[PDB]
């Protein structure tokens, strides 16, 4: 009966495709994903049984996408620049056809990507920044590797969207 509507937005090298995927296994494969997909999974909010459908399309957001949704998290990883600039553009652009400030927002940023060779470049003090930006929305970090906040990340956003109806 209910309908839980997700958009994931942001940029292909932010890591939201191993999160999507690491949600609905538990299990981690690197493999991104250049167009997307359309997801599923029953949950619980207030014992009630919600299904939870999950658009990430890989392009910017539209029209269509953007009315589609009833709460949209976004992506970056804490190790690109451009994952993390690109959110603020996408918000923008969400903004276009939707009123941003009446949806249930969630930012997060991913750590899969740091290494020796690719050091964190987002430090705490400017993820705070772009939380606040974006209407001082939740925010969190994820490692899809080892679990970190993926179940958090998508309870989170449903709560906020059964709690709004």
């Known amino acids: 009966e209910p309908e839980l509507k997700v ?8 890591g939201k495709s191993a999160l999507v995927h690491r949600y609905l296994t ?14 599923k999974k029953e949950i619980v ?5 919600y299904l939870l459908l999950i658009r990430d399309e890989g392009g910017p957001p539209e029209a269509q996408f953007a009315m589609w949704v009833d709460a949209v998290i976004f992506v970056f990883s804490l190790e690109d620049e451009i994952s993390f600039q690109t959110v603020y553009h996408y918000y923008s652009r969400m903004a276009n056809y939707r009123n941003t400030s009446e949806i249930p927002l969630v930012l997060v940023g991913t750590q899969d990507a740091i290494s020796s060779a690719n050091p964190r470049v987002i430090d705490d003090a400017r993820a705070r920044k772009l939380s606040n930006d974006l209407k001082r929305c939740t925010y969190y970090e994820t490692c899809a590797t ?4 993926v179940e ?13 109806r």
Not at 45 to 49: A, R, Y
Not at 152 to 164: C, G, L
């Open 45 to 49: 909010v207030d014992g009630q049984s």
């Open 7 to 14: 958009g994931i937005v942001g940029n292909l090298a932010s």
């Open 152 to 164: 958090r990340v998508f309870q989170d956003v449903a709560q906020k969207i059964v709690a709004t």
């Open 26 to 39: 538990g299990t981690y494969v690197q493999e991104e994903s250049p167009e997307g997909g359309r997801f």
């Open 146 to 149: 080892y679990g970190l906040n």
